[PDB]
mmCIF file of all heavy atoms in Angstrom:
data_model
loop_
_atom_site.group_PDB
_atom_site.id
_atom_site.type_symbol
_atom_site.label_atom_id
_atom_site.label_comp_id
_atom_site.label_asym_id
_atom_site.label_seq_id
_atom_site.Cartn_x
_atom_site.Cartn_y
_atom_site.Cartn_z
ATOM 1 N N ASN A 273 17.577 -1.619 15.316
ATOM 2 C CA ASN A 273 18.841 -1.688 16.072
ATOM 3 C C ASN A 273 18.931 -3.114 16.627
ATOM 4 O O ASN A 273 19.925 -3.813 16.395
ATOM 5 C CB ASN A 273 18.936 -0.595 17.119
ATOM 6 C CG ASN A 273 19.052 0.846 16.669
ATOM 7 O OD1 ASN A 273 18.908 1.783 17.489
ATOM 8 N ND2 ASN A 273 19.311 1.142 15.400
ATOM 9 N N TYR A 274 17.902 -3.527 17.338
ATOM 10 C CA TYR A 274 17.814 -4.857 17.958
ATOM 11 C C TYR A 274 18.131 -5.925 16.906
ATOM 12 O O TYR A 274 18.932 -6.852 17.139
ATOM 13 C CB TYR A 274 16.449 -5.069 18.637
ATOM 14 C CG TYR A 274 16.309 -6.394 19.348
ATOM 15 C CD1 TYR A 274 16.561 -6.544 20.710
ATOM 16 C CD2 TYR A 274 15.936 -7.538 18.638
ATOM 17 C CE1 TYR A 274 16.439 -7.773 21.359
ATOM 18 C CE2 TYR A 274 15.797 -8.774 19.259
ATOM 19 C CZ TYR A 274 16.052 -8.884 20.628
ATOM 20 O OH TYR A 274 15.912 -10.099 21.257
ATOM 21 N N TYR A 275 17.498 -5.738 15.756
ATOM 22 C CA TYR A 275 17.653 -6.644 14.609
ATOM 23 C C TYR A 275 19.134 -6.746 14.197
ATOM 24 O O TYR A 275 19.654 -7.867 14.126
ATOM 25 C CB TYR A 275 16.787 -6.250 13.392
ATOM 26 C CG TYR A 275 16.918 -7.275 12.264
ATOM 27 C CD1 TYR A 275 16.082 -8.375 12.283
ATOM 28 C CD2 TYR A 275 17.837 -7.170 11.225
ATOM 29 C CE1 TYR A 275 16.142 -9.355 11.313
ATOM 30 C CE2 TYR A 275 17.935 -8.158 10.243
ATOM 31 C CZ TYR A 275 17.079 -9.254 10.301
ATOM 32 O OH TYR A 275 17.056 -10.267 9.385
ATOM 33 N N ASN A 276 19.745 -5.609 13.949
ATOM 34 C CA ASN A 276 21.125 -5.478 13.505
ATOM 35 C C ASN A 276 22.192 -5.880 14.524
ATOM 36 O O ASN A 276 23.309 -6.185 14.061
ATOM 37 C CB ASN A 276 21.398 -4.035 13.049
ATOM 38 C CG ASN A 276 20.680 -3.683 11.768
ATOM 39 O OD1 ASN A 276 20.475 -4.537 10.894
ATOM 40 N ND2 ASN A 276 20.273 -2.421 11.645
ATOM 41 N N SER A 277 21.860 -5.858 15.790
ATOM 42 C CA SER A 277 22.765 -6.179 16.888
ATOM 43 C C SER A 277 22.627 -7.593 17.416
ATOM 44 O O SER A 277 23.290 -8.008 18.384
ATOM 45 C CB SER A 277 22.475 -5.212 18.052
ATOM 46 O OG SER A 277 22.722 -3.909 17.556
ATOM 47 N N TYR A 278 21.705 -8.285 16.779
ATOM 48 C CA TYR A 278 21.396 -9.669 17.120
ATOM 49 C C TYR A 278 22.529 -10.582 16.643
ATOM 50 O O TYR A 278 22.935 -10.573 15.470
ATOM 51 C CB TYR A 278 20.034 -10.069 16.529
ATOM 52 C CG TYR A 278 19.555 -11.344 17.203
ATOM 53 C CD1 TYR A 278 18.650 -11.237 18.253
ATOM 54 C CD2 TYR A 278 20.039 -12.610 16.829
ATOM 55 C CE1 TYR A 278 18.200 -12.387 18.899
ATOM 56 C CE2 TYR A 278 19.587 -13.773 17.467
ATOM 57 C CZ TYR A 278 18.666 -13.629 18.511
ATOM 58 O OH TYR A 278 18.171 -14.694 19.187
ATOM 59 N N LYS A 279 23.010 -11.366 17.584
ATOM 60 C CA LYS A 279 24.074 -12.339 17.359
ATOM 61 C C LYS A 279 23.475 -13.744 17.423
ATOM 62 O O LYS A 279 22.964 -14.146 18.479
ATOM 63 C CB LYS A 279 25.206 -12.284 18.376
ATOM 64 C CG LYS A 279 24.783 -12.079 19.832
ATOM 65 C CD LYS A 279 24.948 -10.620 20.252
ATOM 66 C CE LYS A 279 25.800 -10.465 21.498
ATOM 67 N NZ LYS A 279 25.134 -9.562 22.472
ATOM 68 N N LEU A 280 23.552 -14.455 16.310
ATOM 69 C CA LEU A 280 23.052 -15.831 16.279
ATOM 70 C C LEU A 280 24.130 -16.751 16.875
ATOM 71 O O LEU A 280 25.323 -16.478 16.711
ATOM 72 C CB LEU A 280 22.748 -16.297 14.877
ATOM 73 C CG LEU A 280 21.684 -15.664 14.015
ATOM 74 C CD1 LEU A 280 21.974 -16.064 12.576
ATOM 75 C CD2 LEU A 280 20.329 -16.161 14.506
ATOM 76 N N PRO A 281 23.656 -17.813 17.495
ATOM 77 C CA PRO A 281 24.539 -18.815 18.088
ATOM 78 C C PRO A 281 24.976 -19.835 17.051
ATOM 79 O O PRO A 281 24.156 -20.174 16.167
ATOM 80 C CB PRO A 281 23.642 -19.459 19.136
ATOM 81 C CG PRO A 281 22.312 -19.506 18.420
ATOM 82 C CD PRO A 281 22.236 -18.159 17.691
ATOM 83 N N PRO A 282 26.198 -20.317 17.174
ATOM 84 C CA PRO A 282 26.719 -21.350 16.259
ATOM 85 C C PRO A 282 25.672 -22.434 16.045
ATOM 86 O O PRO A 282 25.055 -22.949 17.000
ATOM 87 C CB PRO A 282 27.993 -21.836 16.928
ATOM 88 C CG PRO A 282 28.444 -20.669 17.762
ATOM 89 C CD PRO A 282 27.177 -19.942 18.207
ATOM 90 N N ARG A 283 25.458 -22.782 14.781
ATOM 91 C CA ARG A 283 24.461 -23.801 14.413
ATOM 92 C C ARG A 283 24.783 -25.168 15.014
ATOM 93 O O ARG A 283 23.932 -26.080 14.984
ATOM 94 C CB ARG A 283 24.307 -23.912 12.896
ATOM 95 C CG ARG A 283 22.936 -23.517 12.361
ATOM 96 C CD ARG A 283 22.466 -24.523 11.349
ATOM 97 N NE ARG A 283 21.269 -24.053 10.697
ATOM 98 C CZ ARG A 283 20.140 -24.682 10.394
ATOM 99 N NH1 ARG A 283 19.863 -25.973 10.561
ATOM 100 N NH2 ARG A 283 19.184 -23.870 9.900
ATOM 101 N N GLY A 284 25.992 -25.284 15.535
ATOM 102 C CA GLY A 284 26.463 -26.528 16.159
ATOM 103 C C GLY A 284 25.829 -26.678 17.538
ATOM 104 O O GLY A 284 25.897 -27.746 18.166
ATOM 105 N N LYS A 285 25.206 -25.604 17.996
ATOM 106 C CA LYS A 285 24.555 -25.600 19.310
ATOM 107 C C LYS A 285 23.204 -26.301 19.337
ATOM 108 O O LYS A 285 22.766 -26.671 20.455
ATOM 109 C CB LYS A 285 24.365 -24.166 19.803
ATOM 110 C CG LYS A 285 25.681 -23.511 20.235
ATOM 111 C CD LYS A 285 25.477 -22.004 20.146
ATOM 112 C CE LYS A 285 25.985 -21.230 21.341
ATOM 113 N NZ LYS A 285 24.930 -20.294 21.830
#
Side-chain angles (χ1 to χ4, degrees):
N273 293 168
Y274 183 95
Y275 184 87
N276 291 327
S277 299
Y278 196 98
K279 41 260 234 228
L280 296 162
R283 244 225 189 224
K285 288 157 134 230

